[PDB]
Amino acid sequence: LLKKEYTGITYISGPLLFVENAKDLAYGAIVDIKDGTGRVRGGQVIEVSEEYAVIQVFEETTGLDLATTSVSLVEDVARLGVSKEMLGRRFNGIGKPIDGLPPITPEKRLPITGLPLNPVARRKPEQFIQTGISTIDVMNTLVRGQKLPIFSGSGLPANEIAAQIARQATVRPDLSGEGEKEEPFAVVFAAMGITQRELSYFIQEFERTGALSRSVLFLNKADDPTIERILTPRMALTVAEYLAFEHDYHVLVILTDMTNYCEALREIGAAREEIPGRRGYPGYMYTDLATIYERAGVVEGKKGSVTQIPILSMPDDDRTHPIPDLTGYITEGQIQLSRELHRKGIYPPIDPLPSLSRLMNNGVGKGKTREDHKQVSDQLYSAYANGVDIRKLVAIIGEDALTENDRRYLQFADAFERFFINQGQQNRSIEESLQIAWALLSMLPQGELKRISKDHIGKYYGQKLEEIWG
Amino acid sequence: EAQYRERERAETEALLARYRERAEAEAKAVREKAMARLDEAVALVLKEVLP
Amino acid sequence: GELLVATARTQARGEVLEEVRRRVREALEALPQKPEWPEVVRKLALEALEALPGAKALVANPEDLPHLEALARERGVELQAEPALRLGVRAVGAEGKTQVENSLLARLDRAWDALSSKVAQALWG
Amino acid sequence: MIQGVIQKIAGPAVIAKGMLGARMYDICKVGEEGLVGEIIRLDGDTAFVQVYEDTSGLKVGEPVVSTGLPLAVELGPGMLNGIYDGIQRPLERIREKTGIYITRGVVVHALDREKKWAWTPMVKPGDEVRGGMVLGTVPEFGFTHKILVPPDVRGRVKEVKPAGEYTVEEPVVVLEDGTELKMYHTWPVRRARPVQRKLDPNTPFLTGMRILDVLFPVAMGGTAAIPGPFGSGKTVTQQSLAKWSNADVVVYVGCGERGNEMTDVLVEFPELTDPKTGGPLMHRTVLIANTSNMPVAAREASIYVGVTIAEYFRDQGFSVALMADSTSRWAEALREISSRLEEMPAEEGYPPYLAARLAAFYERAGKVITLGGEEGAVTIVGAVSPPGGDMSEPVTQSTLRIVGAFWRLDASLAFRRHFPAINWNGSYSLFTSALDPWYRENVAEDYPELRDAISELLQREAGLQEIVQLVGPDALQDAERLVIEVGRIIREDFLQQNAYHEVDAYCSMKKAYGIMKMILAFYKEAEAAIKRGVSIDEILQLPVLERIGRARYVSEEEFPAYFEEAMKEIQGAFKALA
Amino acid sequence: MIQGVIQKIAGPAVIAKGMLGARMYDICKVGEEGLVGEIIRLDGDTAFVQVYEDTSGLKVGEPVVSTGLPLAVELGPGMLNGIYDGIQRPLERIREKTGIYITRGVVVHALDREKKWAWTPMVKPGDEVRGGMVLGTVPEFGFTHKILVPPDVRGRVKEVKPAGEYTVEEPVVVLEDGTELKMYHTWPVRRARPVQRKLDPNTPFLTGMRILDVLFPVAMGGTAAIPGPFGSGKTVTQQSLAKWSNADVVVYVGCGERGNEMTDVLVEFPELTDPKTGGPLMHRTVLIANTSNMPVAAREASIYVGVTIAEYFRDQGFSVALMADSTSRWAEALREISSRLEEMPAEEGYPPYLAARLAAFYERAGKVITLGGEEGAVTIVGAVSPPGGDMSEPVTQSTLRIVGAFWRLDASLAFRRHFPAINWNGSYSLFTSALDPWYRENVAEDYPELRDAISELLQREAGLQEIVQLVGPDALQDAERLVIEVGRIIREDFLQQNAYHEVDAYCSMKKAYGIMKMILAFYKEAEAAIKRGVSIDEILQLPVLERIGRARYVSEEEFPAYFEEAMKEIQGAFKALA
Ligand SMILES: Nc1ncnc2c1ncn2[C@@H]1O[C@H](COP(=O)(O)OP(=O)(O)O)[C@@H](O)[C@H]1O
Ligand SMILES: Nc1ncnc2c1ncn2[C@@H]1O[C@H](COP(=O)(O)OP(=O)(O)O)[C@@H](O)[C@H]1O
Numbered sequence A: 001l002l003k004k005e006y007t008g009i010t011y012i013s014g015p016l017l018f019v020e021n022a023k024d025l026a027y028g029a030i031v032d033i034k035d036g037t038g039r040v041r042g043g044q045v046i047e048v049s050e051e052y053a054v055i056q057v058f059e060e061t062t063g064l065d066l067a068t069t070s071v072s073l074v075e076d077v078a079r080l081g082v083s084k085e086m087l088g089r090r091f092n093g094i095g096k097p098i099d100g101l102p103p104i105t106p107e108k109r110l111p112i113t114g115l116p117l118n119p120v121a122r123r124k125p126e127q128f129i130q131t132g133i134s135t136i137d138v139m140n141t142l143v144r145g146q147k148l149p150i151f152s153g154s155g156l157p158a159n160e161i162a163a164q165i166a167r168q169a170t171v172r173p174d175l176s177g178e179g180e181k182e183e184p185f186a187v188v189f190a191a192m193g194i195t196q197r198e199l200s201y202f203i204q205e206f207e208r209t210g211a212l213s214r215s216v217l218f219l220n221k222a223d224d225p226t227i228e229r230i231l232t233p234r235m236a237l238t239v240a241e242y243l244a245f246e247h248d249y250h251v252l253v254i255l256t257d258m259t260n261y262c263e264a265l266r267e268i269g270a271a272r273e274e275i276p277g278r279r280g281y282p283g284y285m286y287t288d289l290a291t292i293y294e295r296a297g298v299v300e301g302k303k304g305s306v307t308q309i310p311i312l313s314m315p316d317d318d319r320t321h322p323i324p325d326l327t328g329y330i331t332e333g334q335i336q337l338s339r340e341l342h343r344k345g346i347y348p349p350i351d352p353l354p355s356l357s358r359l360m361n362n363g364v365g366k367g368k369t370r371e372d373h374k375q376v377s378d379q380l381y382s383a384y385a386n387g388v389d390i391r392k393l394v395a396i397i398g399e400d401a402l403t404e405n406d407r408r409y410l411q412f413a414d415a416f417e418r419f420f421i422n423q424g425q426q427n428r429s430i431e432e433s434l435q436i437a438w439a440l441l442s443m444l445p446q447g448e449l450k451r452i453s454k455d456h457i458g459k460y461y462g463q464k465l466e467e468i469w470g
Numbered sequence B: 001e002a003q004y005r006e007r008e009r010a011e012t013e014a015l016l017a018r019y020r021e022r023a024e025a026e027a028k029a030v031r032e033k034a035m036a037r038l039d040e041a042v043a044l045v046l047k048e049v050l051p
Numbered sequence C: 001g002e003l004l005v006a007t008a009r010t011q012a013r014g015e016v017l018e019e020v021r022r023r024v025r026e027a028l029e030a031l032p033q034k035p036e037w038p039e040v041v042r043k044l045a046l047e048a049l050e051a052l053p054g055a056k057a058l059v060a061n062p063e064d065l066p067h068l069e070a071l072a073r074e075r076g077v078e079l080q081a082e083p084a085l086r087l088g089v090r091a092v093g094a095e096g097k098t099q100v101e102n103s104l105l106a107r108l109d110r111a112w113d114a115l116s117s118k119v120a121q122a123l124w125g
Numbered sequence D, E: 001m002i003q004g005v006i007q008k009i010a011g012p013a014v015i016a017k018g019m020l021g022a023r024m025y026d027i028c029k030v031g032e033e034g035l036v037g038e039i040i041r042l043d044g045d046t047a048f049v050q051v052y053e054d055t056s057g058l059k060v061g062e063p064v065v066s067t068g069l070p071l072a073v074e075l076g077p078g079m080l081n082g083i084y085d086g087i088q089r090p091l092e093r094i095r096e097k098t099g100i101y102i103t104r105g106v107v108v109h110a111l112d113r114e115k116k117w118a119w120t121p122m123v124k125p126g127d128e129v130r131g132g133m134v135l136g137t138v139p140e141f142g143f144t145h146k147i148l149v150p151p152d153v154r155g156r157v158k159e160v161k162p163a164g165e166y167t168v169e170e171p172v173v174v175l176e177d178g179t180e181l182k183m184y185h186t187w188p189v190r191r192a193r194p195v196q197r198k199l200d201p202n203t204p205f206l207t208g209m210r211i212l213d214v215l216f217p218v219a220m221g222g223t224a225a226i227p228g229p230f231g232s233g234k235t236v237t238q239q240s241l242a243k244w245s246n247a248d249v250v251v252y253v254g255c256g257e258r259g260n261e262m263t264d265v266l267v268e269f270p271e272l273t274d275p276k277t278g279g280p281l282m283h284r285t286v287l288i289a290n291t292s293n294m295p296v297a298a299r300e301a302s303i304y305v306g307v308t309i310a311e312y313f314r315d316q317g318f319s320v321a322l323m324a325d326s327t328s329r330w331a332e333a334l335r336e337i338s339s340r341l342e343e344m345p346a347e348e349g350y351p352p353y354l355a356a357r358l359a360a361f362y363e364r365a366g367k368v369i370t371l372g373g374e375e376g377a378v379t380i381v382g383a384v385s386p387p388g389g390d391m392s393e394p395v396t397q398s399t400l401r402i403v404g405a406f407w408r409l410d411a412s413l414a415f416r417r418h419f420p421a422i423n424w425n426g427s428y429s430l431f432t433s434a435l436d437p438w439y440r441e442n443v444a445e446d447y448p449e450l451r452d453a454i455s456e457l458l459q460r461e462a463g464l465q466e467i468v469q470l471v472g473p474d475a476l477q478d479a480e481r482l483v484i485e486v487g488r489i490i491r492e493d494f495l496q497q498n499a500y501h502e503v504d505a506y507c508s509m510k511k512a513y514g515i516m517k518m519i520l521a522f523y524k525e526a527e528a529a530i531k532r533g534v535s536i537d538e539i540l541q542l543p544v545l546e547r548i549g550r551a552r553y554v555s556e557e558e559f560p561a562y563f564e565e566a567m568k569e570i571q572g573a574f575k576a577l578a
């Protein structure tokens, strides 16, 4: 092709610049910017007219003057060069590799925004995953193909929970009844504003468990420019859709700290004077979070899958804020961490009431894990919600004024929090988690267990905590 | 513990040496495969660059 | 160890692709000492002037100045020579704020992505 | 026609110029690919166009070709057992042409032009036809799909094609003028279909869920609104209404929601069986599916295509349900497109014509007598998704005015898995005084007095909740404690209903009447037994509570043989009690 | 050289025309006095200068002269025992040049260009030098200021001037490219100085306190944030960090706060003595002052100047501690220039890039190995001042996502004069799991378990205190009261430190560990003695409880001989107990 430069930049401010006499630039095109010192920045075209054109600039805006700094065109729509020998590499936010190795030989050039997946050509996310965590196994079951994030705060250990899920998630082929192969997970790790401590923990965890030969990392550090965060998740999920739907892998996508992505798009949507939604975030943040999240799941007749675990830092650790609220409106389920249980010394600090896996009912039940599972989940939720709302009644009438079965709920609550939730770094399969759930349910007599049927309560009731370990 | 420590050292060294040797063999093999196969592609890129 | 042998293989492949890039670089560097250079200059200069709607001026080499001379005195285009632009032509379009460069190394840098995607499977398949 | 060129592209918004003579709300082929767009705000010699696909790779100078018509649906045989997008392109044909990704610029016809249909006519040559009159009859999955004269068509029949197999393009009735009438006709999506009279509603829309049919009912020509936070129970409730209600046809409008919860409806509906017939459940549903990652400007079109398809099946004599989820996503789509119009908004950012749009949407329901003389109905159940979880929004407190039968979902009843999470205190229904004679005839004679007694026990419970949350569960008297425990047994055994158990996903109101009769018999006889003096908490330990608790799990076949035994066990246990 | 004139003046904004080719974020001399400003918002032939000085009395038409270089500090010898302002000109040379008031637009050199420093070379002629490599050394005060190649300079050494004494502008190493390397170099403050590799922090930053190193420690390459309203300490804690630390050099940057603290640090530091090398405490502090009455656009630059100076002393092998004081006032300065520039706000006026600027400031702290081979570290303690208490601020929740230690101050706990006012239930650290091997090899062996026992006693007392406030000290059983008494001994002996007492201002890890062993020995041997029949109203009035309570008033040398005798007294005052 041929080099097409545009001189005549009229206006530069913040993340934006205007170039006039620019007609052959398409909307959504990629431009690069050369100043008088040869440094070549990047940018994307976001408004085109016969008068001028608007470019969002992917780097710092230092040393760009107006007598120079030609704007050249590349990739009339924004694409990414994707390959299969991409699974041991690290990349920056735009996709240039930072590992010392040469750039990859692209096997295809996929469009980086990604087309939406046809609802007729989908498939029900069905197959049970186990993550070794008793809450996310018994009560909020992740299945292969699901989008569930981790809603967390500021000091809470969400990264350790995501790395633990990433190192011990395995499908159970023997209980499912599809034979056995033990296909492990490819990992796509997108990270937007990890500082240095989170990055050090993740790369030491991955190299300690031996996963960097199966993973591809799109890293974006805290001091890197804050506009390439817009392109980071889209080019992570381009590679994820490629590896799952044209080479039939089982890609698990860890999308770290979506709140930094949302504040990056708040920055670029307040540079353009656009009317906001709630709390200054623009009106199209639902559409952007949807176009990122909804690029996951399973398709029909093909062996692949894209499972998503995002991580959110809820600002004032509430569900009311626009970022976790709109996230929970697109995605299907959440795993919400509590600061109330973290100060008690419990890891993983997951309170099961606000956290919910939506399509748990497609991956549980008889012939998939075990026939008692959904009723056991409902009775655990009923009894622990009774314990939680009877703690307030204890707080306003004192301890000694309780009936019996009320102290039994109050003992179920802290036995639950200290034995079912509180584990270590230990990997517990679905049978240990179900027998610990039954050993806690044996603290309540029949007639309170009015959500479990009679055959299940006849053949599983009657085990104490002194038999699930010692 | 002394037995398994020395067994770990001996087996890890004896396996990593074979990995280094297989790496050197694979690099030399792919270079000698690529070198004789060359000059077909330079006509392809020189034909497609030029108008 | 498997990561070591995989990095060894891909870093061996990278220098092979880099030296093939150097060979085509010298192939189109020692190309203007050949009588098909006025033909290819006229072709790429007409492609630049046609892909730029209504150009004004052209920038070339002094030695590359007469070889598009038949295209110089038609189309109503101004001409200018520079020695810095060692390869290819340049077309300044109708005001001075739009410019089309058609250098040979530029064309190599534009097309080298799909070129390498075919070269690797050509010499390794 | 009206040729212009693209002047400016910004998001899903294209300003074209040189389009002088174009009308508002038309359809434009934007660009060389032929994208579908709509004209809003024409000024000077320009036109602002919202595009129903994504613009990325368009560029200035590309032509815009206007059409001259508003957005119109094709209405004829071939819509049942079908999935369409927001501009009515059938998605299975798109999956046949493209791969698994929905591309832009593709063109398919809504109705099959190759499928034969079994035409049998009703009109003879020499008849007079006005708009809405039937012409013939075509079978469709057991349904008798009757073919209508389009509205604003009057004339005299010259010839009728005889009974046989014909495609949808074949002109089956040629009138006395040059007019020919195919098996389908187009119709706009903002002109509500003409009608002869609008009846008042006196027949309930039987959901099947016990609380939404007993305490807060919906008449067959009534609207209803179900708001709630995320994770509360909206989409599971609407798929339950799509799965178990007594609608003859069901139009499910996914307006800016997930693709997995449309894949669920595509996959597991052909495995089910429609009540009132024997054919599968997918054979009575039309499914408009404009998901979340599809282009945002098509959600208005997606919410109108469903209501005009439901009006078309209303005009045939059916009783249509319209489950439209996430009207707030249509409101957000209007906000995102009004940002490109650089207008001034009302509260929260929404454009100020939003409640006019909502009134014009919810007013298109309501138990009519059609132009053909026979009667039909559309009943619209709309899910609202409040942004902050708060029902104090310009969408929620506009549908809250223009609706009857409001169903508020709280999150506190959904944290503990108590489904459906109907907030009893913030829900109402304005139809409990119009459905009274139907209840007295077709359920039982003392049904509404039993319902009003259930409602006043829930009121007495909610009155005592202040005192019992301040002082405690003790220091009450015994009658008030009995009221609180009977309120607990109502909330756990009549209101609660899990929609995955085999029995108890559907509940006839004979069964709900039996459960309420058992709970009131228990309450009145325990209250009489506790006034003369027996202890509290020996009534809470009685074994008939297991019968009342498992009473919602028994089948409807053996439910009288369970009801008589449980009622006699109530009186016998209270008689042997002393 | 680009020289234009002024078009518009509005506050510190100077819109200047004629500026064509003026690069962004340069430094330009605006006005005929020589005011320093920085160029943002290029528009046509027109810049937008934020001035870093006062702006009154400028007329339209006065020349702006762009220098073509970004905001850069001078980095060399002559900086320690130094006070600078927000654009690095020393205030003492200003008062010896101008007067007791800070006037407008006075030019001095940041380093002293007549000080004679002793050169001692470490590069013989002929060698090859890279960026960050040491050239030679200079004895500064008691330190060893090694001077180094600028990070963007690579070459071969042509000649070296011999070991004498020279001025800081004397070219001591002339490379074989013509490039002269001086004793100082200028560096742009918005560019992070490069490294070879960032390590992991594994060695604590010993703050000398007892609640900010035992319960909530920050490591050497860590980042910490101190919120808190007024009257809650927050200045004495910052000065205690500046006085009693293990850091080699301290950069104390204070932007937007009062000047009595600056003159307090200038008065009372040269009389003290750091407990590392001897000599005055001021010979390791570089303090940057931008008082609240000083100009408001310069406190943006003050933070970058401070962190660039801390990175310069980090690139030599030291362990810098930077105390960044009222970064919320820097957020207010960004709010000021953002509203002057006509930008959209987000969440109470602050610009949307506030969290990005704040993350790019806190990201420069770290434990690295430098380009010279040697390792270094820089830690950052940022005091944030949220307005109404109210930790839901934009600046507080923006700095809260990135820091590794959060030290919350209270207002209900500083009204009892309980200083330091760190909320021990609500503050947190993240370096506790990483500093455990250093603890096990350098303070004790059971040091983490003793800390965890102290923390769970504090948690138990915190949970128990609410039902105490319910019922009083009567209905507590017996151990419920002993938990309170041990918790009060903790929060009045261990978690309380004067910083005005002569000896209770510093506390090494051994003394805090000894007080922890005394408290846990008292609790462990009194709870076992309360069940052999001892009243709770006997266990408190022992004479050994005072020996616990005044243990924080003994010296570092008297403390082991005090500790073993106090352990004898605690073990022997319970044997005679009955
Ligand atoms: N009526 C119900 N019966 C049984 N389970 C339910 C019911 N409503 C909700 N749930 C459970 O909670 C989830 C709620 O999903 P949904 O209602 O779609 O959330 P939202 O309404 O916010 O979109 C379901 O996936 C299901 O697991
Ligand atoms: N300073 C600015 N520079 C460029 N574009 C802006 C600026 N401020 C607002 N805008 C954008 O200009 C758009 C105006 O839309 P308009 O020009 O009417 O039609 P279109 O969206 O088709 O270009 C808005 O979407 C708004 O986001």
Ligand SMILES: [Mg+2]
Residues within 6 Å of the ligand: D234, D235, D257, D258, D325
């Ligand atoms: Mg939904």
